Amino acid sequence: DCTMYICGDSTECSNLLLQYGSFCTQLKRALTGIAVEQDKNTQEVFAQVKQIYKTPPIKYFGGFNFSQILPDPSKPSKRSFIEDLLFNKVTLADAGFIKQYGDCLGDIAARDLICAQKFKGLTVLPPLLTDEMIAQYTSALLAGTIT
């Protein structure tokens, strides 16, 4: 929100900003152009298969043990043992999910940077493909090549 960033909570400052006008739109479009591209990138990398392949129930492959890179049913998200390792290593800022005012008011708002940035008109958006959907495509690619 270029207006809440530039002009904190003021209709009068919103009147002044209107003499500049098309700058704000040009920045919003430019950030929207980037936000659309993140999904295209993810689609071009992972969505290469138009079918979602599965491995058979009997995992044998000539002695080759893919069980550490294949999906595990016991996890709620279908990620592999190596995927669920990698997901601990990167400490993401705002993974798209809701803040519900039970949380970004009171305790967590006293020390959360994401809840701070939100109030200054700066917003992170979710990817179109969830990490469970990227696990599914990554499984489909893996199950395809091992069979």
Binding site: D9, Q117, L128
Partner: protein
Amino acid sequence: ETKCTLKSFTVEKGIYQTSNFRVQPTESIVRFPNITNLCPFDEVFNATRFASVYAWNRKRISNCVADYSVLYNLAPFFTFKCYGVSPTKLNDLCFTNVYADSFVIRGDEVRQIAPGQTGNIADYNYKLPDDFTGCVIAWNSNKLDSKVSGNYNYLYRLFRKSNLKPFERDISTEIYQAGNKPCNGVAGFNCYFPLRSYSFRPTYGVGHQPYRVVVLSFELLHAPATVCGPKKSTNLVKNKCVNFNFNGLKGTGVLTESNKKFLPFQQFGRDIADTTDAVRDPQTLEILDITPCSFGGVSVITPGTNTSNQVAVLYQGVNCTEVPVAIHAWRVYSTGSNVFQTRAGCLIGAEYVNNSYECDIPIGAGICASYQTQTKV
């Protein structure tokens, strides 16, 4: 709103971000520490005896809150007057110093008190400077001080070799000369004691009965202020959006009780973003959170305008229980029934279904929207 934001009548199929949702303040609220010590009007005006106009008193008002209106609204009717300032501004103003000058006169030299004046009371004993800021407060003391014998102990100076300087008060009881020959001793031809009593009794008329007088002569605004006026305050709301002031910290937001504890001397609190997000209540000491009144980017989902005018709305990062609190008192999507919670925010005006298609309009977080013939007339 999309047509206005894109500056075209025809909007193609897509999701478009628009003016941000923001709930408005319901009212204004103001808070100031419930007034501290007040200034000494009961000494300046409610004294047992006033000084004479030759003997005219000087007093300092300092380290206190002034309250000009309640002094005027005490039980007696007293005749306030002015010379050179907005009288109704003063409650809303601060002073470098507040000085009162206090005296008694009859009802006719009351005009000789003002600056620029001349005549005996302007010239010899009581002069204000010809740039004076302030007002003159008097009353007929004939109900209280006037004595049927003559109360004669109120005197005035009526001669001075020279006109005395602004705020020079002259206490020198020197015999004054109107003849050219020198006045040796206590008396002589055209040699005078330079003062005389006033004959005040309850029978003396308008212009001649006794009046107690005070001048306020303050210095103001340019240097660090010793006395200010009274600062107004309302009741203390919660959980509703409001325009707020606390102690001259000015913002807008939702006040809420905080379990965060300030140290005794901290008045406001700022977030990681280096701007205020909490304050202490100055009348009653408690720690209040400030939240900027609720908001969230509004993105509109449309098929091609060439095909329909039906649209849906995503309130980005909003939980669906919050957005109906933004009741307008555009808003037809408030009625609900078709409402869905996405991870991206609250979605309204589209129906959620189990028929997982290919994508068409990308909403985010694995949700897509499409305009379709919903018939699993």
